[PDB]
Short mmCIF file of all heavy atoms in Angstrom, two decimals:
data_model
loop_
_atom_site.label_atom_id
_atom_site.label_comp_id
_atom_site.label_asym_id
_atom_site.label_seq_id
_atom_site.Cartn_x
_atom_site.Cartn_y
_atom_site.Cartn_z
N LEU A 66 21.73 -4.62 17.79
CA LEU A 66 21.98 -5.45 18.95
C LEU A 66 23.35 -5.15 19.53
O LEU A 66 24.31 -4.92 18.79
CB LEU A 66 21.87 -6.93 18.54
CG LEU A 66 22.66 -7.35 17.31
CD1 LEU A 66 24.01 -7.98 17.64
CD2 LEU A 66 21.83 -8.25 16.45
N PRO A 67 23.47 -5.12 20.86
CA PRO A 67 24.76 -4.79 21.47
C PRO A 67 25.67 -5.98 21.58
O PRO A 67 26.74 -5.90 22.21
CB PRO A 67 24.36 -4.29 22.86
CG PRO A 67 23.14 -5.05 23.16
CD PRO A 67 22.41 -5.21 21.86
N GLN A 68 25.28 -7.10 21.00
CA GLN A 68 26.02 -8.33 21.17
C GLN A 68 27.22 -8.39 20.25
O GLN A 68 28.03 -9.31 20.35
CB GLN A 68 25.09 -9.50 20.89
CG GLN A 68 23.77 -9.37 21.59
CD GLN A 68 22.84 -10.47 21.21
OE1 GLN A 68 23.15 -11.29 20.34
NE2 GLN A 68 21.68 -10.51 21.84
N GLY A 69 27.31 -7.46 19.30
CA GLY A 69 28.22 -7.63 18.19
C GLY A 69 27.60 -8.53 17.13
O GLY A 69 26.97 -9.53 17.46
N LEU A 70 27.76 -8.18 15.86
CA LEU A 70 27.13 -8.98 14.83
C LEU A 70 27.84 -10.31 14.63
O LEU A 70 28.92 -10.56 15.18
CB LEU A 70 27.11 -8.25 13.49
CG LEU A 70 26.21 -7.03 13.37
CD1 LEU A 70 26.36 -6.47 11.98
CD2 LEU A 70 24.80 -7.43 13.64
N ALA A 71 27.21 -11.18 13.85
CA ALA A 71 27.92 -12.30 13.28
C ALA A 71 29.04 -11.76 12.41
O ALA A 71 28.78 -11.09 11.41
CB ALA A 71 26.98 -13.18 12.46
N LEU A 72 30.27 -12.04 12.82
CA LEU A 72 31.43 -11.35 12.28
C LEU A 72 31.67 -11.74 10.83
O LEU A 72 31.81 -12.92 10.50
CB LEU A 72 32.64 -11.67 13.16
CG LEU A 72 33.88 -10.78 13.07
CD1 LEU A 72 34.55 -10.77 14.40
CD2 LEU A 72 34.86 -11.31 12.07
N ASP A 73 31.74 -10.73 9.96
CA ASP A 73 31.98 -10.92 8.53
C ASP A 73 33.45 -10.58 8.29
O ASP A 73 33.83 -9.41 8.22
CB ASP A 73 31.05 -10.04 7.68
CG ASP A 73 31.07 -10.42 6.18
OD1 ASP A 73 31.78 -11.37 5.80
OD2 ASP A 73 30.37 -9.76 5.39
N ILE A 74 34.28 -11.62 8.19
CA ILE A 74 35.63 -11.43 7.71
C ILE A 74 35.61 -11.01 6.25
O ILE A 74 36.24 -10.02 5.86
CB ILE A 74 36.47 -12.71 7.89
CG1 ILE A 74 36.62 -13.09 9.36
CG2 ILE A 74 37.81 -12.54 7.27
CD1 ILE A 74 35.70 -14.18 9.78
N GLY A 75 34.86 -11.74 5.43
CA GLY A 75 34.87 -11.55 3.99
C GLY A 75 35.25 -12.82 3.27
O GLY A 75 35.34 -13.91 3.84
N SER A 76 35.47 -12.68 1.97
CA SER A 76 35.90 -13.82 1.17
C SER A 76 37.39 -14.07 1.37
O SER A 76 38.06 -13.39 2.14
CB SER A 76 35.60 -13.60 -0.30
OG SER A 76 36.40 -12.55 -0.83
N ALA A 77 37.90 -15.07 0.65
CA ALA A 77 39.32 -15.40 0.76
C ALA A 77 40.19 -14.33 0.12
O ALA A 77 41.36 -14.17 0.50
CB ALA A 77 39.59 -16.76 0.12
N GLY A 78 39.65 -13.59 -0.85
CA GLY A 78 40.46 -12.61 -1.55
C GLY A 78 40.57 -11.28 -0.84
O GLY A 78 41.68 -10.77 -0.66
N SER A 79 39.45 -10.71 -0.42
CA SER A 79 39.43 -9.40 0.22
C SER A 79 38.78 -9.50 1.59
O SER A 79 37.58 -9.26 1.74
CB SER A 79 38.68 -8.38 -0.65
OG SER A 79 38.58 -7.14 0.03
N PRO A 80 39.55 -9.85 2.61
CA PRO A 80 38.99 -9.84 3.96
C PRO A 80 38.94 -8.42 4.50
O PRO A 80 39.79 -7.59 4.19
CB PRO A 80 39.97 -10.70 4.75
CG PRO A 80 41.25 -10.53 4.05
CD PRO A 80 40.92 -10.38 2.59
N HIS A 81 37.90 -8.14 5.28
CA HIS A 81 37.81 -6.89 6.01
C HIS A 81 38.91 -6.94 7.06
O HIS A 81 38.81 -7.70 8.03
CB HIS A 81 36.43 -6.73 6.62
CG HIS A 81 35.34 -6.61 5.60
ND1 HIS A 81 34.01 -6.71 5.91
CD2 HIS A 81 35.40 -6.38 4.26
CE1 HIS A 81 33.29 -6.56 4.81
NE2 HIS A 81 34.11 -6.36 3.80
N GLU A 82 39.95 -6.13 6.86
CA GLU A 82 41.24 -6.38 7.49
C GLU A 82 41.19 -6.20 9.00
O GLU A 82 41.98 -6.82 9.72
CB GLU A 82 42.31 -5.47 6.89
CG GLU A 82 42.62 -5.76 5.44
CD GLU A 82 43.29 -7.10 5.23
OE1 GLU A 82 44.06 -7.53 6.12
OE2 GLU A 82 43.06 -7.71 4.17
N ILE A 83 40.26 -5.39 9.50
CA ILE A 83 40.08 -5.33 10.94
C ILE A 83 39.35 -6.56 11.45
O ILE A 83 39.77 -7.20 12.42
CB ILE A 83 39.39 -4.02 11.36
CG1 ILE A 83 39.17 -4.02 12.87
CG2 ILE A 83 38.12 -3.73 10.56
CD1 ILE A 83 38.75 -2.71 13.41
N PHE A 84 38.28 -6.97 10.77
CA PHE A 84 37.52 -8.12 11.25
C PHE A 84 38.26 -9.42 10.98
O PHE A 84 38.01 -10.42 11.66
CB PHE A 84 36.14 -8.14 10.62
CG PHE A 84 35.24 -7.06 11.11
CD1 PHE A 84 35.00 -5.94 10.33
CD2 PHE A 84 34.62 -7.16 12.34
CE1 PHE A 84 34.17 -4.95 10.77
CE2 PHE A 84 33.79 -6.17 12.79
CZ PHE A 84 33.56 -5.06 12.01
N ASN A 85 39.17 -9.43 10.01
CA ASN A 85 40.04 -10.59 9.90
C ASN A 85 41.10 -10.55 10.99
O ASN A 85 41.29 -11.54 11.70
CB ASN A 85 40.69 -10.65 8.52
CG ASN A 85 41.23 -12.03 8.20
OD1 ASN A 85 41.06 -12.97 8.97
ND2 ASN A 85 41.87 -12.17 7.04
N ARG A 86 41.75 -9.41 11.18
CA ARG A 86 42.87 -9.34 12.10
C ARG A 86 42.41 -9.09 13.54
O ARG A 86 42.63 -9.92 14.42
CB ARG A 86 43.85 -8.26 11.67
CG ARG A 86 45.05 -8.15 12.54
CD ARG A 86 45.89 -9.38 12.36
NE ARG A 86 46.43 -9.45 11.01
CZ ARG A 86 47.05 -10.51 10.50
NH1 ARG A 86 47.21 -11.61 11.24
NH2 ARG A 86 47.50 -10.49 9.26
N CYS A 87 41.77 -7.95 13.78
CA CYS A 87 41.52 -7.47 15.14
C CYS A 87 40.10 -7.84 15.54
O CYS A 87 39.12 -7.17 15.20
CB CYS A 87 41.78 -5.98 15.21
SG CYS A 87 43.48 -5.61 14.79
N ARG A 88 40.00 -8.90 16.33
CA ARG A 88 38.74 -9.60 16.51
C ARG A 88 37.86 -8.91 17.55
O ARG A 88 38.26 -8.76 18.71
CB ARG A 88 39.04 -11.03 16.93
CG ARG A 88 37.87 -11.97 16.90
CD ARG A 88 37.62 -12.45 15.49
NE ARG A 88 38.74 -13.27 15.05
CZ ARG A 88 38.88 -13.68 13.80
NH1 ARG A 88 37.97 -13.37 12.89
NH2 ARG A 88 39.92 -14.44 13.45
N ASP A 89 36.69 -8.45 17.11
CA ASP A 89 35.51 -8.18 17.93
C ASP A 89 35.54 -7.00 18.89
O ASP A 89 34.48 -6.53 19.29
CB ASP A 89 35.14 -9.42 18.74
CG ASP A 89 34.26 -10.37 17.99
OD1 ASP A 89 33.36 -9.88 17.28
OD2 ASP A 89 34.47 -11.59 18.09
N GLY A 90 36.69 -6.45 19.20
CA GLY A 90 36.75 -5.23 19.99
C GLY A 90 36.33 -5.44 21.44
O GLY A 90 36.60 -6.47 22.04
N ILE A 91 35.65 -4.42 21.97
CA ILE A 91 35.46 -4.28 23.41
C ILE A 91 34.07 -4.73 23.85
O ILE A 91 33.93 -5.54 24.77
CB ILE A 91 35.73 -2.84 23.87
CG1 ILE A 91 37.22 -2.55 23.89
CG2 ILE A 91 35.14 -2.55 25.23
CD1 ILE A 91 37.53 -1.13 24.26
N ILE A 92 33.03 -4.19 23.21
CA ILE A 92 31.67 -4.34 23.74
C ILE A 92 31.14 -5.77 23.68
O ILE A 92 30.49 -6.19 24.65
CB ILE A 92 30.74 -3.30 23.09
CG1 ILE A 92 31.19 -1.89 23.47
CG2 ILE A 92 29.31 -3.41 23.59
CD1 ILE A 92 30.53 -0.84 22.64
N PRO A 93 31.41 -6.59 22.65
CA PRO A 93 31.05 -8.00 22.82
C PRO A 93 32.06 -8.78 23.61
O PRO A 93 31.79 -9.93 23.98
CB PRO A 93 30.95 -8.51 21.38
CG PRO A 93 31.85 -7.73 20.67
CD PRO A 93 31.81 -6.36 21.25
N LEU A 94 33.23 -8.21 23.88
CA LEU A 94 34.14 -8.87 24.80
C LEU A 94 33.65 -8.71 26.23
O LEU A 94 33.91 -9.57 27.08
CB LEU A 94 35.55 -8.32 24.61
CG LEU A 94 36.65 -8.94 25.43
CD1 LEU A 94 36.63 -10.42 25.20
CD2 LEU A 94 37.93 -8.39 24.96
N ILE A 95 32.90 -7.65 26.51
CA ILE A 95 32.23 -7.53 27.80
C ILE A 95 30.89 -8.24 27.78
O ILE A 95 30.50 -8.88 28.76
CB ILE A 95 32.09 -6.05 28.16
CG1 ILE A 95 33.48 -5.45 28.19
CG2 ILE A 95 31.47 -5.89 29.51
CD1 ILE A 95 33.54 -3.98 28.25
N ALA A 96 30.17 -8.17 26.66
CA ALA A 96 28.88 -8.83 26.55
C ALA A 96 29.01 -10.34 26.50
O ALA A 96 28.03 -11.04 26.77
CB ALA A 96 28.14 -8.33 25.31
N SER A 97 30.19 -10.85 26.18
CA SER A 97 30.44 -12.26 26.39
C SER A 97 30.46 -12.61 27.86
O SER A 97 30.23 -13.77 28.22
CB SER A 97 31.76 -12.67 25.75
OG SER A 97 32.05 -14.03 25.99
N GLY A 98 30.73 -11.64 28.72
CA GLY A 98 30.69 -11.86 30.14
C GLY A 98 29.35 -11.64 30.80
O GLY A 98 29.31 -11.48 32.02
N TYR A 99 28.26 -11.61 30.06
CA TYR A 99 26.95 -11.45 30.67
C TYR A 99 25.93 -12.28 29.91
O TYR A 99 26.25 -12.96 28.94
CB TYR A 99 26.53 -9.98 30.75
CG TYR A 99 27.26 -9.19 31.80
CD1 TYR A 99 28.26 -8.28 31.47
CD2 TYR A 99 26.95 -9.35 33.14
CE1 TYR A 99 28.92 -7.58 32.44
CE2 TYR A 99 27.61 -8.66 34.10
CZ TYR A 99 28.59 -7.77 33.75
OH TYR A 99 29.24 -7.08 34.73
N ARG A 100 24.68 -12.22 30.36
CA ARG A 100 23.64 -12.98 29.71
C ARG A 100 22.41 -12.17 29.34
O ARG A 100 21.80 -12.42 28.30
CB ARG A 100 23.23 -14.17 30.59
CG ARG A 100 22.17 -15.07 30.03
CD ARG A 100 22.63 -15.63 28.71
NE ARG A 100 21.62 -16.49 28.13
CZ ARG A 100 21.65 -16.92 26.88
NH1 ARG A 100 22.63 -16.58 26.07
NH2 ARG A 100 20.70 -17.70 26.43
#
């Protein structure tokens, strides 16, 4: 799906450091602007 997945940060111990820090990127930031 081009919507971006349900974002998996991870557990409290080992977060996926991009998905914890750098949120969602470009394509769902544009897909948030459409329907």
Side-chain angles (χ1 to χ4, degrees):
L66 50 97
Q68 312 176 355
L70 291 180
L72 197 149
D73 192 1
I74 297 101
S76 67
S79 176
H81 295 167
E82 294 293 328
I83 178 169
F84 290 103
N85 199 3
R86 182 68 66 190
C87 299
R88 191 80 66 189
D89 274 320
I91 285 177
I92 296 167
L94 183 55
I95 302 168
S97 178
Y99 286 106
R100 182 58 181 168

